[PDB]
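pls ignore typos typing on phone
nickel (II) ion + seq
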Amino acid sequence: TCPFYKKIPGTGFTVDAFQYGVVEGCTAYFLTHFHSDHYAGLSKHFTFPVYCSEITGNLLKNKLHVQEQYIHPLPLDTECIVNGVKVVLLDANHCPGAVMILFYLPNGTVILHTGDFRADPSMERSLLADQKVHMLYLDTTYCSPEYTFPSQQEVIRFAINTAFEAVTLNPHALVVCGTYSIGKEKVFLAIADVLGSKVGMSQEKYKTLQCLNIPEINSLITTDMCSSLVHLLPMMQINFKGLQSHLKKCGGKYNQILAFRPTGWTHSNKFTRIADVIPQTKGNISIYGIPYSEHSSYLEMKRFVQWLKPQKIIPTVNVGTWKSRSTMEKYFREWKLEAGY
Ligand code: NI
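k done
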């Protein structure tokens, strides 16, 4: 059944709750972003109001074929009324179109639902600065102190420098980048920009990217693989067998592959710096795992929460085990005693 952490009390609303059939008592279904564990269940047969960003609404219409009459896109940073209740959508610094949602309950309670987010100090100057938030529905993906990772900027500088050096040393090297969802577009776009190429990809992935309102996108991507020396492939193909196979397909245009796998966290984060990352190599194929995250590190999460000072925290990730739930509740209490709220 629908878990309690997907329901907004005092309303008829749910958040990211599309796989339970008709949730009894739900008058509006909000969708924070277009990732499959969150939209799971939506299709052209859905006949309840969906509230989301413009970009998420473009993906719902073009990829899932949800009918236009049920898609209700809202502008960001704007007070809107939904079924009698004031709401605001805020940028979540996750993937394109991802939002956090502020609910102002008729009784005076204010609720923030982060969706998935990568906390940033810029959020401390949004509309959140303007009033107290009582309850926080928090993306706790990386809520443990082992999870450190570099800034997105540091990671993109590493990728751009690595690719440019390799292709300038060998003009017959191909660059390949893995993907299995929206998000992390800066990785392949920044590498293609330094190389003066468009990124080549499948018709399905091109259609997806054309929904994202990215400026000048027609100048940056293409379905013509032959004209491109940065290719995108399914993350599943980013291994030596899949890449050897891909190289055969390019008809002797290339004699070397340099590939990137933008993972979340991996245990080499506890020991190694970004300047010291090395690839896995077999023959003329090299694969780099780069720690490009679209979720909060532990320290970013802790700074946001100690700033916001909520009265109550409801985790939305890692909630399925008693050991994970107890660990998280211990950190929440530490943070509250340290900061004095
Ligand atoms: Ni997500």
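The helical segments are 36-39, 54-62, 152-169, 185-195, 203-209, 240-249, 298-308, 322-339. The longest strand covers residues 256-263. more later
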